[PDB]
Design a protein around this ligand. Sequence first.
Ligand SMILES: CC(=O)N[C@@H]1[C@@H](O)[C@H](O)[C@@H](CO)O[C@@H]1CP(=O)(O)OP(=O)(O)OC[C@H]1O[C@@H](n2ccc(=O)[nH]c2=O)[C@H](O)[C@@H]1O
Ligand SMILES: [Mn+2]
Length: 548
Amino acid sequence: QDFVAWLMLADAELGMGDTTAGEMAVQRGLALHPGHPEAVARLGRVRWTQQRHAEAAVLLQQASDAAPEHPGIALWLGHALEDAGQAEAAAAAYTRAHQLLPEEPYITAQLLNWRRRLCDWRALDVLSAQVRAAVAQGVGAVEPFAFLSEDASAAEQLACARTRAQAIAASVRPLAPTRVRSKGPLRVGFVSNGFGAHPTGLLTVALFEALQRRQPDLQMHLFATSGDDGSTLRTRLAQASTLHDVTALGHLATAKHIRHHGIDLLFDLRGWGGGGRPEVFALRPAPVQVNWLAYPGTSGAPWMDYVLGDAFALPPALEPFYSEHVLRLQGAFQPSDTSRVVAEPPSRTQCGLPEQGVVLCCFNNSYKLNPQSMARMLAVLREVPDSVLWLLSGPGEADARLRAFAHAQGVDAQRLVFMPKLPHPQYLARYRHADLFLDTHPYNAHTTASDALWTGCPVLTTPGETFAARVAGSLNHHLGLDEMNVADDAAFVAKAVALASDPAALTALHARVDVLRRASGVFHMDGFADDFGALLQALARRHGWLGI
Ligand SMILES: CC(=O)N[C@@H]1[C@@H](O)[C@H](O)[C@@H](CO)O[C@@H]1CP(=O)(O)OP(=O)(O)OC[C@H]1O[C@@H](n2ccc(=O)[nH]c2=O)[C@H](O)[C@@H]1O
Ligand SMILES: [Mn+2]
């Protein structure tokens, strides 16, 4: 007959992963004091872990109303609103929560991440500062993936990453160590939530296909942390490897499953950004663990032996900012699905383009569209009379905010065009109307840059000082397109303008993109598989492998 105790014990089930016996406890808490903000909020947290995202928000909105000053409620409400797909309302609650506890960094950082997603730039500079300070001070549980959006050095990214990795490591007891097998075929494993219609699957599929044909001595094992999505990608990946569906397994069981298969080299294709699975790596189920492709920066993690980069994206000057030992592929670090035949799109009109005019384009998640990147794109529009800027439609009112900024920047708002979300092949097809792709800084197009070039659309970029800001530049460089890697904003604006105001030169550059996309190594997955396989083998011998 004890109220406080019920919620306290309901919390103990949560914490230990007890949705069902935890709900019995919360419900009985509500049967003593019905409508009490502390229980009403808690019931909404149940529904939320049970994945009843919409009922959660209805309940958490009650509490919030019953106590608009309770910061924990304000915050919990926001998560539910977010996970219920209500972007704008979600950012309002974090805005309130931040205002209730102006100096709680944990909240500031989630606030910042949501504003960037909605292209809401109010007091952006102050929030960015507060997040970076929090990284400095070790506080805030800033997430390394979110941090990539900030203009922060490689030194700051390492701080963020390694603090985060160290907190996780302190809560985890690694599996007993093991060594790379001495003899026999190498077992190489990759952990990922994106084996299907997602960037990781999309980038790695033709590569796994080539490895299957060309590197018979390496056994590729995919550990998929997501179920089968019906995509040809997922099916092709399963056909080109041994795919283990470990969706549903906890961290410990996933790590145990990897160990069960005696994986020699384990690759994190998550990496710091997915649902996670970070403790799966903290458990050290494989003797050599490699950060590659998925997370574009250092893991900062004591459980990660290596990072796999390339000479341009991960140049020598950048090595000290990586906790891992750095390995490099001979060409670009990024593979791609060179089996794609880009289809033909609907007419320009049907894609919301004017029938005439240069179409500048930047397809990229909203959080990469920062003021600096937008402003240099708007500058090109201002200098080139009939051009247009093509963007992906973003969440909530992001599109309207960009429109207003275009106006504020002296550009007719209607010269922005927003592509709705489209299955991959239809989206890829859109590039055939694109004249020039304008990269963002400091977080480049990554998968979208690969898409553009594969279709034949040039990418203009300003290689920066962190790996995430040199990816597009690495593709350009390995393709041979160095004139498309330029020094700074002024040079980026001047280059996009020289090209857009001269349609013959722009056409010549499309023809040059086409020759180089045929000739260069960037899009030869046979040679990528050879180089990848040889690296894997050399790395395994360095750890005792005596070969097949
Ligand atoms: C792989 C990589 O280099 N970067 C990581 C990726 O590995 C990771 O798993 C993901 C998790 O956050 O973060 C970035 C993705 P990143 O590489 O940044 O790729 P994004 O720009 O997020 O691209 C999303 C994907 O959706 C496709 N698209 C987009 C819009 C549309 O309407 N239709 C469509 O098909 C694009 O081809 C792209 O492949
Ligand atoms: Mn298995």
